[PDB]
Amino acid sequence: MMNKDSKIYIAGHTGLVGSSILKKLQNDGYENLIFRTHSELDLTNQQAVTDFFKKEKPEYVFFCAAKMGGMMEQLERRADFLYLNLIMQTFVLHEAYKNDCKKLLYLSSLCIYPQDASLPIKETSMLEGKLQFINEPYAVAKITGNKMCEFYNQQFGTNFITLVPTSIYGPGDNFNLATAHVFPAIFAKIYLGKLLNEQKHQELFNSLRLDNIQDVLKYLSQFDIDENKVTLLGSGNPRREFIYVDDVADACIFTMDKIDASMLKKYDENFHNTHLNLADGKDYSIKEVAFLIKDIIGYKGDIIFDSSKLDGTMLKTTNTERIRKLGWKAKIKLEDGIKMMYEWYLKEQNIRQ
Amino acid sequence: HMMNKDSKIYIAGHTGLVGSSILKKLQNDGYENLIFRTHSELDLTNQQAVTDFFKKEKPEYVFFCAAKMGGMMEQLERRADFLYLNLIMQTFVLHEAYKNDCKKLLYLSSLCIYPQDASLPIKETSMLEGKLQFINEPYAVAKITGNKMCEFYNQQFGTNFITLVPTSIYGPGDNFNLATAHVFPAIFAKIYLGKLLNEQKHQELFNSLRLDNIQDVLKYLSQFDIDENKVTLLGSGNPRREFIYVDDVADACIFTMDKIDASMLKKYDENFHNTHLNLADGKDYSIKEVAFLIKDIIGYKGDIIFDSSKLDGTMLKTTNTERIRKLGWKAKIKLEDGIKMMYEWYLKEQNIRQ
Numbered sequence: 001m002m003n004k005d006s007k008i009y010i011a012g013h014t015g016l017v018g019s020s021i022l023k024k025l026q027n028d029g030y031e032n033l034i035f036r037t038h039s040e041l042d043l044t045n046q047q048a049v050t051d052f053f054k055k056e057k058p059e060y061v062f063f064c065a066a067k068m069g070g071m072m073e074q075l076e077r078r079a080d081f082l083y084l085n086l087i088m089q090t091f092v093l094h095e096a097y098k099n100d101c102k103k104l105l106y107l108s109s110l111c112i113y114p115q116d117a118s119l120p121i122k123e124t125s126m127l128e129g130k131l132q133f134i135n136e137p138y139a140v141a142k143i144t145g146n147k148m149c150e151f152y153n154q155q156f157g158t159n160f161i162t163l164v165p166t167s168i169y170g171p172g173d174n175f176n177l178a179t180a181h182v183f184p185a186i187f188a189k190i191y192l193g194k195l196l197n198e199q200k201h202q203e204l205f206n207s208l209r210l211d212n213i214q215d216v217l218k219y220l221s222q223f224d225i226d227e228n229k230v231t232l233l234g235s236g237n238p239r240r241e242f243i244y245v246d247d248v249a250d251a252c253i254f255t256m257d258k259i260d261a262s263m264l265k266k267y268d269e270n271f272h273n274t275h276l277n278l279a280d281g282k283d284y285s286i287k288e289v290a291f292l293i294k295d296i297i298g299y300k301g302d303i304i305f306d307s308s309k310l311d312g313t314m315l316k317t318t319n320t321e322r323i324r325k326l327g328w329k330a331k332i333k334l335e336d337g338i339k340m341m342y343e344w345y346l347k348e349q350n351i352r353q
Numbered sequence: 354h355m356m357n358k359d360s361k362i363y364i365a366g367h368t369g370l371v372g373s374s375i376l377k378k379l380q381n382d383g384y385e386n387l388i389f390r391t392h393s394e395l396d397l398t399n400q401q402a403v404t405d406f407f408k409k410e411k412p413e414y415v416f417f418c419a420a421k422m423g424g425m426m427e428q429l430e431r432r433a434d435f436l437y438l439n440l441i442m443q444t445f446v447l448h449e450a451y452k453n454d455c456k457k458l459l460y461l462s463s464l465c466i467y468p469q470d471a472s473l474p475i476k477e478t479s480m481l482e483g484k485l486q487f488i489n490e491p492y493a494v495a496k497i498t499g500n501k502m503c504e505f506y507n508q509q510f511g512t513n514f515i516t517l518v519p520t521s522i523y524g525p526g527d528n529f530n531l532a533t534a535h536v537f538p539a540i541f542a543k544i545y546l547g548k549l550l551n552e553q554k555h556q557e558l559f560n561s562l563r564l565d566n567i568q569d570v571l572k573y574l575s576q577f578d579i580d581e582n583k584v585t586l587l588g589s590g591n592p593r594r595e596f597i598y599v600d601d602v603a604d605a606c607i608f609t610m611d612k613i614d615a616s617m618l619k620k621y622d623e624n625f626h627n628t629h630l631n632l633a634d635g636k637d638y639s640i641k642e643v644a645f646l647i648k649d650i651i652g653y654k655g656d657i658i659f660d661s662s663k664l665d666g667t668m669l670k671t672t673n674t675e676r677i678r679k680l681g682w683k684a685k686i687k688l689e690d691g692i693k694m695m696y697e698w699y700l701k702e703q704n705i706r707q
């Protein structure tokens with residue numbers, strides 16, 4: 001349905017997901033792709049989004065802009081992670097409607113779901129129970145975004161489509177040890193632990209943008225990482241699914257080509273909980289993932305789990321019957337995704353950290 | 354009693370039912386630095402206008418009484434509008450109140466935040482614990498997000514953003530538009546116009562509805578199955594809920610602003626979780642009980658009929674008020690007196706919202 005010459009806007013194109021969607025549409029030869037850096041268009045400025053949408057009137061919108069961070073950043077920035085994401089999504093979704101966009105893809109998150117939802121989690125569990133405390137700010141932004149799509153679809157006849165991915169990983173992520181989500185954090189922690197263990201001082205200098213090992217050792221000691229051990233957060237017991245960034249990009253494009261409002265009414269004629277879960281593969285513990293990374297990248301040191309730090313939800317699995325029956329499948333297995341991310345990590349000179 | 358007579362006090366939505374009652378009380382009590390703007394003067398849906406206003410006026414206390422709302426049938430149509438307009442108004446006001454170092458803000462919420470199957474009487478801790486009433490979802494989502502935004506600002510920034518969750522309100526200054534009004538003003542206005550028609554008070558009907566002749570008045574009212582013999586209301590009349598008079602809400606808002614701060618909310622929950630305060634007075638009444646009481650008070654001679662072919666929604670709502678009761682708040686106005694005060698105002702007022 002998206003034509004080669006359709007005006008396609010990718011919001012948050014510099015991010016993990018947005019960069020993968022933009023790269024794929026560029027590779028696949030789409031002719032009319034529009035995007036703006038945060039510097040060029042601040043999506044927290046109501047009038048700037050109004051002006052952009054009125055000038056450009058994109059036919060398709062992939063909403064990939066967000067301000068997020070891992071568990072510890074979420075426990076600090078309670079106001080910021082509600083506020084910034086509420087306004088960005090509300091201005092983009094509203095102006096996409098006011099300027100007669102054909103379809104919009106809203107990216108949501110598993111934190112919409114109740115902590116004690118029956119497993120595997122069904123899309124119909126949204127708003128049926130108490131949230132995970134850690135995630136409440138972002139969860140409330142995402143629930144509100146999901147419901148906003150439903151209400152625009154119902155009142156205005158829009159095609160505002162929601163995909164709810166599991167935790168994502170791959171090239172282009174935020175690997176800042178303090179602010180990263182679990183997968184990029186533990187990958188970056190184990191990788192730096194490996195360079196230290198193997199006395200690869202120059203790679204550590206180049207990777208961390210530091211000049212001497214006193215500064216490297218001091219930076220890494222903050223995370224209880226030394227030449228012998230890499231310490232990770234919590235018990236390592238929480239279990240969840242992971243999905244490779246290029247599979248999410250593929251699913252977003254697939255959904256934008258193939259789903260409309262009329263198809264959502266087959267799930268619920270009032271658009272109630274008509275988002276689609278997006279997941280691939282089994283659940284893994286954080287400890288299993290850590291040990292898999294350690295094997296793949298050849299780390300010889302110890303992985304210790306500092307159980308003095310928080311775990312939240314101990315088990316997440318996702319019902320993916322809606323998107324499976326629509327015909328989507330993942331291409332990238334966890335071992336291959338780790339290898340692709342490692343290959344990229346070894347060569348990228350502008351890593352987010 | 355911590356707002357001073359000279360405190361800079363902003364009442365957002367000052368022309369509405371709650372806002373007008375708070376402004377009138379503070380004017381009458383001699384507060385000297387009251388700040389307010391009409392919707393025309395300050396559109397709270399414009400981010401930059403809200404920023405400009407807060408930067409200029411730097412209010413110390415904010416009463417957030419602005420909203421775009423409507424009864425059950427308007428809510429079933431305006432799914433997008435009732436989320437969008439309220440989400441952006443509250444987000445801009447709460448954020449700019451933080452950015453401009455307000456002392457305290459009072460956020461008004463609504464019982465639709467609660468699960469349809471919440472255990473009764475409803476406790477504040479039931480918010481986000483279960484499925485909402487479908488009819489109310491758009492406004493309910495705006496209100497849940499507002500309640501949570503006050504919690505998050507309180508936790509991250511040490512603000513004093515305080516939330517009251519009133520039951521259905523009634524009184525002078527309401528929206529009495531027969532199609533868009535909430536249940537209490539709707540049934541009052543329907544019964545009152547039914548009374549005038551039953552009593553052949555054609556001139557009062559022309560004055561009230563701004564129509565020229567009885568044919569026009571009869572066409573308009575026949576939309577609601579109101580005629581010279583009877584008044585038709587929506588549903589079975591069996592749904593039950595609490596009602597609170599507008600001036601009791603105004604008094605509770607002022608009491609809350611004088612008496613609660615963040616330190617006090619932490620006594621309910623150290624992380625501000627579900628630390629809004631329910632606001633209710635009195636027993637649950639059926640819509641039929643309120644309709645019959647209005648009939649009795651205004652002396653309507655006609656029949657009241659409940660059109661069962663229309664929706665009832667949630668069948669019973671009662672509220673746990675232990676928090677606000679332990680703080681020392683009490684309602685002053687009983688239902689019969691509130692109806693009489695509303696009727697007295699209705700028979701005088703030249704600019705009723707209809």
Ligand SMILES: NC(=O)C1=CN([C@@H]2O[C@H](COP(=O)(O)OP(=O)(O)OC[C@H]3O[C@@H](n4cnc5c(N)ncnc54)[C@H](OP(=O)(O)O)[C@@H]3O)[C@@H](O)[C@H]2O)C=CC1
Binds near residue numbers: 013042043064
């Ligand atoms: N990563 C994951 O594990 C998961 C992600 N998702 C969802 O996918 C979406 C994309 O996430 P992800 O790609 O990981 O996020 P990223 O942090 O990688 O990317 C965020 C993007 O938003 C941009 N942005 C942030 N603030 C603004 C602003 N004020 N104006 C304009 N642009 C802005 C960032 O640019 P800049 O950096 O220059 O500010 C960047 O382009 C989100 O909705 C997220 O919740 C869902 C499931 C899991």
Ligand SMILES: NC(=O)C1=CN([C@@H]2O[C@H](COP(=O)(O)OP(=O)(O)OC[C@H]3O[C@@H](n4cnc5c(N)ncnc54)[C@H](OP(=O)(O)O)[C@@H]3O)[C@@H](O)[C@H]2O)C=CC1
Binds near residue numbers: 368372
């Ligand atoms: N009434 C009830 O039964 C209940 C009310 N509450 C809550 O109390 C609060 C006040 O409700 P209530 O007094 O009944 O509401 P009203 O509809 O009576 O008043 C709404 C006010 O907001 C103003 N307003 C609307 N849109 C804008 C805008 N874009 N910019 C600026 N001002 C605007 C209106 O002005 P104008 O008319 O000129 O547009 C008016 O001053 C709400 O949060 C409501 O949910 C809670 C419990 C029940």
Ligand SMILES: Nc1nc2c(ncn2[C@@H]2O[C@H](COP(=O)(O)OP(=O)(O)O)[C@@H](O)[C@H]2O)c(=O)[nH]1
Binds near residue numbers: 070072179181185310
């Ligand atoms: N952010 C992060 N989480 C980690 C790390 N090591 C383990 N975890 C665990 O992963 C979970 C947090 O995941 P994260 O992506 O931060 O947050 P979430 O997706 O919102 O749950 C917690 O159990 C942490 O204890 C790490 O280095 N960083």
Ligand SMILES: Nc1nc2c(ncn2[C@@H]2O[C@H](COP(=O)(O)OP(=O)(O)O)[C@@H](O)[C@H]2O)c(=O)[nH]1
Binds near residue numbers: 425465533
């Ligand atoms: N709006 C309205 N509701 C009515 C009327 N008569 C009865 N009701 C009942 O009042 C309830 C709707 O209340 P309303 O204030 O519109 O919405 P809510 O407070 O969001 O539930 C339902 O139980 C209706 O059946 C009427 O004339 N108008």
